[model samples]
Target chain A: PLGTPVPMEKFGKILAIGAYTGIVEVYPIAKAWQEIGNDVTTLHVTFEPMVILKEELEKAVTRHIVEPVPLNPNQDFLANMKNVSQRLKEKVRELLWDLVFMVGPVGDQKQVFEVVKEYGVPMKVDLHP
Target chain B: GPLGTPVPMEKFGKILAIGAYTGIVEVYPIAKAWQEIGNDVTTLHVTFEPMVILKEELEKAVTRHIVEPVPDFLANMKNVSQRLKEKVRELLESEDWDLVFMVGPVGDQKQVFEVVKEYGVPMKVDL
Candidate 1:
C-alpha cells in the first residue's frame, strides 16, 4: 500500500486543515482518491492547495500545484479561510473536484461548508473531539 | 513507573499528537510498540485559534510529524495559553514512555516547537 500504482486507474479531492490544526482523517483517504482518480488537490494553512499528479504522491508537497492562498495564515486566518473556501467553491463548481471529503474540527464559517453543500458535491466530514 | 519519567514501562499507554502531517501511519511503530506493551494510545490534534480555546486533550506523540503553526505574524499556533500549556505538560509528564520516537518539524513551524518542547524528553527538534 506504500508504492505507486500502475496506470489505467484515476481520481480527486482537496485537503483543508480545519483547526489550530490541519484536519486529521484526510490523508490516507486523499491518497486513496488520488490512486483511483489519477490525481488529487490539497489545501492547508501551511501546505498550499494543488493538484498531485499520478505517481507523484511522494513529491506532491512540492511537485503539486500550490494555490495562491497563504501557506501560513494564522494572523490572517479569516481572510485565508474565505480565500480557500471561495476558491474551493470555484473548483467544485468548475468540475475540478469530483468529490469532497473533510476530517477534523471543521470550524470554518458555515458558509464555507455551504459552498460545497450548495453545489451538491458528495462530501464526508468527521469532526474529532 | 508512575508517569513522565521516561522509563521502560511495566505496563503501557502512550499518546500520539502528530499534527496532521500525513504521518499518523508513518509513525506507526511508536503507537504499535505502545500497544504491544499492553497500554493505551490516542492520537489527538491541536485546535485552531478561537476554537483552540474551545477544546481540550493531553499527552500526545508525534512520530513522523511537522510543525505547522498558523501565521507567525500573529503567533496563531501559540497554544499560548497557560491552561493549555499546563494541561499539555501535565498529561505528557503524567506517564513514563517506553518509546519517544520523533521525526522533525524542520523549516519554520514556530508554534509546533513551543507546544512540543514541554515534553522534557530528548527529541530531534529542529526549527
Candidate 2:
C-alpha cells in the first residue's frame, strides 16, 4: 500500500493533541491508523510549546520501542541508555515525516514518499520484530 | 528666503519624484504648484501594467535609499510595490486629481512626462 500499516499489536492507543496560539484541540481516535492514516491528517500544532512536547514524546516512545531497559542492573547500562537516546531521536524523526507529508504541499508527494521509504518503512519494520 | 543657485526648470526636465505611500494628501501641493505656472496636468489611474512598472521603481528606491537593510517585510520590494500601487490607485480613482503624480519608477516618469509634456505638466518633487 501507500505506507506500512501500524503493527497489529500497536493498532490502537495513538493520542494526538494540537495547539495554536491560545487554541487547543485534542483528538482521541481509537485505532486511528486503520482509517485516519489513509486520508490526510492535518494536525496543526503550535510552533512553540507543542513542538517541544512532541519532540520529547517521540524520544520517549522510540526508547520504549527500540531499546527496552532491563529491570535488573547491568554493567553496560549507561552505554545502553546512550544507544536508546540516539535511536529515539532517529525514530521520532521518522514519525514526524508522516505528519509532515500529511500537512506539506501536494507537489511534495514524491519527495515525501522517498523519505518514507528511506526512514519510515525501516523504523516500522524494526518495531514489528 | 536664502538666495542661492536657482537651477533652470528646463535643465531639470524630469525631477526625481518621491513621496509618502500613504495617500493623495501629498499630491495637493504639487498640483497647486503646476497650476500656478499655467500648466495643465492630468493624473491617469492604471492597473496591472503600471503596477509592473512600479515594482522596478521601488527596487531602485530601496537600493538608492535604504542605508541599514533588515530582513523583513519592509525590505521586500514586491510587497512595497503592491502596497504603494494599491494606495495610489485608490486615491487617483476616488478623487479629482489632474496631475498623475503616481508612486512609480524613475523610468515610468520618462513615459508619463513625455505623454503629458505637450500639456505643460510640470514635475514636482515632494521631499
Candidate 3:
C-alpha cells in the first residue's frame, strides 16, 4: 500500500520489486522500511517508467536505478528477455533479503519470487494496489 | 525480417497480439503491419494512461481487447490484476490463435504467456 508500513514493527532487509504503477506504489512502503533503519532496496523492473501520478513519480525516481538492458536486434527475443530477467534476478541475489515487497503483475512477482524463494524469505505480494 | 516489416503472407492468418505498458508500442506497429497485409489480428492489451491513448487509436485498425482500468490503484491492487489474469486466460481459451505476438514484461504478461504455452501456439515474444 502506498504510504503504509507493513504491520510488522521490525523489517530486517526489504527488497521492493515493481514495474509500471507498481514502481510508484512500492516507494512509500520501501521508504517507510528504510526510514526505520531496515535495509531496503527497490528495483524498478522495467526499462522505462510507466508512471501515472506526477507526485509519486518524483519519489519513485529516487529508487535504485538499474542500467536498462539494451535489446540486441540480432539476438533471439527470448534471449534478450533472459538477459533482462537475469539482471533483475542478480539484484535479488545481491543480498539475503528478509522480506520482499512486490507490486505488479503475477509474472513480475514470480520474476522476483524465483530468487526470493532461494532464501525462503517472506514476501508481501500486492498485485493490484 | 526486422521488427516491423510486413510478412509475405500467402494466406490471411489468425494472429493474437498481446502486450502491456511500453511493450505495447512495438506490438502495435508489427501487428498492424501484418494486419495491413490482410491477416486477422486481435490484440489484447493493458497499460496505464497516455500510452492507453494508443489503444484508442489502435482500435480503429485491429480487433482490440483492453483490460479494464483500475480506478483506484491504491485501493484495489489485487482485484485488478486478478481480473486481468482472468481476462487473458478467458481470451486464450476461447480460440485457437494461429500466432501469438507477445510484447511484455508488462504487468501480468506471464499469465498470458503461460496460457499461450498451454495451447502450444507459435509465439514471437518481444520483451
DockQ of 1: 0.05
Off by over 4 Å in 2: A1-129, B1-75, B102-104, B107-127
Error of 3 at A129 (Å): 29
Query: Who wins the lDDT comparison?
Result: 3
- By TM-score: ranked, best first: 3, 1, 2
lDDT pick, better of 1 and 2:
1
Candidate 3 clashes between residue pairs 3 or more apart in a chain or in different chains: A128-B77, A128-B78, A129-B77
By DockQ, the better pick of 1 and 2 is 1
Candidate with best DockQ: 1
For every model in order, what is the iRMS?
A: 14.1, 30.8, 13.0
Write down the TM-score of every candidate. Answer: 0.36, 0.19, 0.45
* lDDT of the candidates, in the order given: 0.37, 0.29, 0.59
Q: Count backbone overlaps in model 2.
A: 2
What docking class should model 1 receive?
Answer: incorrect
* TM-score of chain B taken alone, candidate 2: 0.30
> Candidate 1's residue-wise lDDT over A34-106, tens digit each?
6554455644322343222223334432223234445444644445555555654554445434455443223
Residue-by-residue lDDT tens digits, candidate 1, B17-104:
3322222322334444555566555443333432221012122332322222221322432333333344445445666443233321
Q: Grade the docking of candidate 3.
A: incorrect
Question: By summed lDDT, which 10 consecutive residues of candidate 2 chain B come out lowest?
Answer: B64-73
